[PDB]
Symmetry: D2
Subunit: 487 residues, 4 copies
Amino acid sequence: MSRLERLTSLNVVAGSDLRRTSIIGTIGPKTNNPETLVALRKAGLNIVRMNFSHGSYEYHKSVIDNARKSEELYPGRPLAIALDTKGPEIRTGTTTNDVDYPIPPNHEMIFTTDDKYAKACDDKIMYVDYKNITKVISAGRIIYVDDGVLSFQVLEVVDDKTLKVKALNAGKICSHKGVNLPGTDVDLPALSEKDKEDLRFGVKNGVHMVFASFIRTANDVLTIREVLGEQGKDVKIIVKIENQQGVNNFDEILKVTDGVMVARGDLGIEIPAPEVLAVQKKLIAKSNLAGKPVICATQMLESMTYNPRPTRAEVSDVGNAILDGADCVMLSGETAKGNYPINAVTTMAETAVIAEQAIAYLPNYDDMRNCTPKPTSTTETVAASAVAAVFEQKAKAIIVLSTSGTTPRLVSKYRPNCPIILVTRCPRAARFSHLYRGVFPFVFEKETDDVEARINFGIEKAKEFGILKKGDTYVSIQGNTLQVSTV
Amino acid sequence: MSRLERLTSLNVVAGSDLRRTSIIGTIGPKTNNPETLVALRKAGLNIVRMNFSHGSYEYHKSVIDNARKSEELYPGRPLAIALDTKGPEIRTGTTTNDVDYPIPPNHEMIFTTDDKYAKACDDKIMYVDYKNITKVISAGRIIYVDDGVLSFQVLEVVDDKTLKVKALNAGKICSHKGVNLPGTDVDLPALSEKDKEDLRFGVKNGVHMVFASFIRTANDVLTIREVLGEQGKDVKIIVKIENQQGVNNFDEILKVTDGVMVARGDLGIEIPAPEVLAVQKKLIAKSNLAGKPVICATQMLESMTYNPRPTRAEVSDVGNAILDGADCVMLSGETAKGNYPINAVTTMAETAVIAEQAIAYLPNYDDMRNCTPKPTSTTETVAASAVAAVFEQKAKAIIVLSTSGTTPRLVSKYRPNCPIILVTRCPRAARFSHLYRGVFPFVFEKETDDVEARINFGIEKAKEFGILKKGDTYVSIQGNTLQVSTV
Amino acid sequence: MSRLERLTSLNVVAGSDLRRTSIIGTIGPKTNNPETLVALRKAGLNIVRMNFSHGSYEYHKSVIDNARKSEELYPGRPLAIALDTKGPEIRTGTTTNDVDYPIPPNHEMIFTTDDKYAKACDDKIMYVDYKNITKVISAGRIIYVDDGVLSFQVLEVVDDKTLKVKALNAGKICSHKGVNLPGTDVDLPALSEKDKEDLRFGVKNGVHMVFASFIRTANDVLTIREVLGEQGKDVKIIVKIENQQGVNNFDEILKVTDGVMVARGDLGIEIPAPEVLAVQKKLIAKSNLAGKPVICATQMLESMTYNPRPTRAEVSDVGNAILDGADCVMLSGETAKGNYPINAVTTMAETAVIAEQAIAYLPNYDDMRNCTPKPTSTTETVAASAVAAVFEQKAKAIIVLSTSGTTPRLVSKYRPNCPIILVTRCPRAARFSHLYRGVFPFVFEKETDDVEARINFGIEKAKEFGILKKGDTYVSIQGNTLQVSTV
Amino acid sequence: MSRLERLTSLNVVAGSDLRRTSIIGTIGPKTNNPETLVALRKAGLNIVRMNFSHGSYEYHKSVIDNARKSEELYPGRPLAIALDTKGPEIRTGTTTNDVDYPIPPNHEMIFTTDDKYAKACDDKIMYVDYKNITKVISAGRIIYVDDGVLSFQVLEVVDDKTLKVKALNAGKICSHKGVNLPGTDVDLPALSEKDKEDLRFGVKNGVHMVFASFIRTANDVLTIREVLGEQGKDVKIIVKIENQQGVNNFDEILKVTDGVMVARGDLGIEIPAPEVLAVQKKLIAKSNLAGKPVICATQMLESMTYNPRPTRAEVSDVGNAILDGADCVMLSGETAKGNYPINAVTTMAETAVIAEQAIAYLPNYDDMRNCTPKPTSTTETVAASAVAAVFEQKAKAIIVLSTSGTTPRLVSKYRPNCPIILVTRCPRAARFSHLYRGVFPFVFEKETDDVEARINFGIEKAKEFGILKKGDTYVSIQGNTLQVSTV
Ligand SMILES: [K+]
Ligand SMILES: [K+]
Ligand SMILES: [K+]
Ligand SMILES: [K+]
Ligand SMILES: [Mn+2]
Ligand SMILES: [Mn+2]
Ligand SMILES: [Mn+2]
Ligand SMILES: [Mn+2]
């Protein structure tokens, strides 16, 4: 309980413990190649993310077999591919004479959705590819343009394709940039006709996850669940919370989803910037309770794109997201468009280890069990129980055999302060298990009087990582028993 | 105790409560003028900081009477001037043809301290104003240049003014930038012959604080205490921790000092970057226990220099520093060299209020009293006690009369979840009291059967801030009694 | 929190601390005289109790001026007289040839209420002074006789003055003993026509309390409150819980009452014996929360009537009642009919001191403030607050001036681990203040720039008790301020 | 943590839960016969105790096969026989003309150890069978005679067989009564030449325990361990703490022993009576930590010997001993010399159930694990762990297979709030397992792919006790795994 004595004792300096939080990294043209993909994975990259906001399936299919290629050149930790939906966003039209950039000072103008002005639009009018904004929008609303650099107080609603508006601030109007609707119930499908194809393209191409952008409600999840199809039942749906509709509803959404990602980016544009701080820790905490894998993402080491050294805020943000309960850390343009991607993963990583040597494992564990123990599913009771075991005997590991990634995810929920060695035969679960914090998957084959072998796989596999020293003390899990033998 | 239920309930959105954490802001040539100094103070600037690393006393004396000037144009909250020692640093020579910037790739070159190459130096040689590094330095050591963006494995020691070296990383060599000596006992004094003058200049000029850069030990503090002199007894010494010598000793230093500032900048260069995360919270926690005012500083909204919108890390770093116990938030180049200084204070501010509506006031309060209660100085017993009072009766304020800023600082230590109205006659204490988190000073004059008036000053003064609604409930403190009347 | 480490460290042996729990002692013919009344008071008797179940007003008026007489011979601690209502009970008739005691084995017989058999009754019939039982009673009901040593399954209802019955157990039938009706709504008033006189007699005679026997509901209290009258507003009503009607309603009763006494005796007859254990601690705990003075009573050192040494249970019951929160300990026949009354108070006493050196003052204090702090009456906020003060500075005392016994009772509620010196001018409050645990009243006369004197009364008065050593540390309370000066 | 809300919610009335604390009952001539021995066992008697302070081996061997006989007539719960050493006590000589009883008022006299006055002693002199008191005793010491009813200030030491003494109080000197030496290091062997025989007699006769009276040090235990011999390795040594030597050393003694009993009787004579209160809870708490079975004994329902109804103190002492952590409750003369032994066990029992519905199972559990978890033996880690399991899933039972009574004892240590069904093949462990609170042993025969049967023994055996309702939830333990299947 001595938070103050926990704090006053932080005893810094990254020690012997292996990083437990998986590092998600977006890939750009630069980073798309085995050699780099390797220096990246070696440095700490766990999962790879492909933003389907740009790029042809050629542009992407490339990335995959390249990662698959890095796996060939040197397997190391199993890597995971993940599709990131180009959700229902808003791209304004193009400026007439190409790159012409008229400059509104704080004047009145007019946005329209006619396409007649698509390629030919600027200063006087503006195109927006969301044919319905006129319905979902209302005079008084404030539209934002290009990373919310521009504001537009909705003055009126002309026609039903026309919108009288006024620049609330300066800047020059450019072409094709994202439009943000702060405080407007968008009816856009979380998934579009193309998105249905990108998913289907991913499923086919065997990507393990999906980060559905701009999720507003549970149905949206249910929808992307079936669109994924029977062949994609085994793939994870990582809801992306980046708007009010997605927060003023998170709870019912958290229910049906597999995971959740604090899509900081738009979220920070969508709602007030300062609000995030609380709207972040709140969703991670809520996630933790639900037991589902959460991910913090965007601008963590943003500056580490043009620079080799990250800032104070960035470092002291990577660590915090972990203290708040994040299961994974992301990297967007620091890997898909930056000069120092190797250092990126390398700084994130280094910070995660110091950020885990500060956690209050015992008390945090208790708090988590004092929430809805009544109950508790048998796998979760054994989950919590095993965790307690190590806290007592000071166990070093906690080998658990699985296929659904259920048993190791639950233990994860109970955040042990020792490696969670998951021995599995299913290759798929071993890849998407980097979603749950602290889980070190390994794939075992051949084929309950045989599980001792699998347990010897994880033990020896643990030994190679220097996690067990023999005559140590580990806890196993399987059918639902619970072991606690020695090395 | 329900940290999870505290977290899951965060209920964001900046509400009615007034910001309690004072905002420190460095001033640059741009920001130096009343009009701006006002828009700044209005937005939230509490204290002003002048980095004595550059600028003539003309360059500075200006800043002061300009702030004093903003006080004239419109007093608002009392403002505080603060000198920031140009500690014992090491600035490199200049590049020959002015701004010429040769680019080392990872080559061997040679640093020298001859001054014959001071103004004329680059690519082949390099000047350093620390004539002794040759002695304190040793082959194997790793020199850092400009925010440690560059590294230099000390290859050898040529002559005693020459040092064979190799760029451990890329970059282009520029002129006049700070040199960091990670792992080298520097023999330069926390205070120099000039520094003794800058302080004396400040004392004379009535600056309320001093942020001694590069403090290594307690003596250093004792020294700057006497250098300050009798006329400067009433001014605060805010130790700046930016090296290992300052951490591997913090505890004995904390003793004698008034405050402490996590000089993130060099500190992050001095010691490992990731290390800071823990080395930050640890020092703030230690400070809190000691009860002395701590300050977080540098790169909090760094990007908010070239941009109007801050990043995710930055926002979710301003708030965190406050959760970790910081009494004040700083702003370096976001005010002294940035394009959007008004937005800076304006974003910091907005975040601080959301960051204080997340704290666990009751439990944090308890934890703090369970550390060395034995005792406890009478002013601290009354301090803690009063705080408890408000926690029971749900008090809105806590008016305390003082002159030493002792009584209000201690209550501060016990972080009440309501405004701490300090009524005073001493103008000086009312200015430097923005050092202690949550204290809202006000100056009262004229001149114990009269304190009821001063208490009516704070109450009415509280009312103007909408802190009391009459028939509310407040707790007073004075001689040592403890009140608890109604409005 | 370390209950186990609190337990494992109990470090027994009555030490220096003065007993804080007042000792209530009933007086019998034997004990009625100054000399004895003194040896009793000297040994520890605080309050005296007169059971109005027997004795003429001559029989009683005697006791009073005899105690008043002991006060004369030697004042010592101020003593308090207390009337104990001869509540609506049911006494059985007398056995024919005087003390003849027929012995029923498990036979059928017949209870009647004819008075024709009052003085002449036994074996075949039995008299009961409750003329209505026939109505309120019903075949199947189980009557209890003399400390419920005998049981009587109501076989039938003969006539309306006759009741066919069967001894459910052995024993010999004697004369005049109390009859208990477990599970029968008795229509007799908490107060009777005579009781109204005994109270009025007591008020007149200046007895400070009243222990209303057999209270069933709040009205009963309200009734005895007005019966007491204007002249008896200043006297305390100590509800006696000895039936189901009184428990299945305690909460609404606790509201309006001043105190509450766990009338163990009948209560143990009324409801199951084992049930008491929980039905005891529950009512004391509930009392503590409400802040009203509770008293444990009956059979604590029962055997210490015929013997000089008490039993294990008795000793380890006197202490427990105190751990459970009792403000006072009683003595019935161990003082009003026993051979060793001096040893009784002397054993109770000795045990109370060991029983208070085992309490968890800090944690118990916290728990108490975390129940309805919202608020909290100003006198209670100052109450709780002062207590906290001593916990910090390790205060030895806590002098509080009062007249209502409000301020010292509330502090009491917050059970400080140091003497609560109440300085008063009202003699009455100083007598009934032995009701609140830990309060050491003292009477001060003459007659806010003077309270320093009264505070010097308590301090010096504290010194005579060796509670303060000068240069110690005490906390005062008065108008509502809160002091904390030194000795 | 809400002790107050735990207390305020006690919700009395013995409910559905089965008593978990075993009831130890001493047998007298009266109680020695199957019929009674049965009504006793049926009512709740778990273990039987034979005080070897009196009775011939004929007097005792009788008791055993009578209990063994009650087992025959109707097995019910397995019963356990236990020998209770006639430790090194002190019986004064006899009065000359037989029952002559001279009366000392407060005079000086003389105790001697010559035997010449053995049968012929009184008024002038006194015989004591402890030939060494003269050495171990010292002028100033205070001897006690017959239940400490008499005191004797050691005036001087005449000769080395003579002791000048003075009656510190009145009374008449009788023959053969126990002499107590408060504050005198007795060198008497905890075991005597005869005791060595009584044990050996017991071992042979297959009694499961031994309650060594008057233990002073660890050696004493070690001694009775070897005297017991190889054939008695499987029998339990229940140390009896009844003197200062045994408390001022408990910790080193607790080490090597199996159990511990708070021999209240002499202990209360040995040391101050009030002291016990703390010296009781302290030893039980210390026992709990050590994990060894503790027993509270003597005078719990003392009065329930001559009366059918117990007192308030007694009831509210039986329950308390259980709250303080006692694993077993005893009954001395309430069974071996009383008129109502059936009611005795029947009241104890009834109280134990209400006394277990008040415990704070969750918090008490935590506290226990936060003491020395480092560690922790694998059987204890699994022990603690399983307990936690039930707390989560709200398990009803916790079947554990054993032979050493190790696994079920440890779980016991972690006091689950559900029945601990121990399935065993060893008849001996099933009998002495009533030593550990909450354990419900059952014997299973025949003869790890078979343990499912034994688990089905306990489950079905649980069902007969109505502990499981099928589709409930239980936790198993065996080789060291840990199960958690359903019914
Ligand atoms: K996207
Ligand atoms: K500086
Ligand atoms: K009465
Ligand atoms: K014995
Ligand atoms: Mn987005
Ligand atoms: Mn610096
Ligand atoms: Mn009664
Ligand atoms: Mn004994």
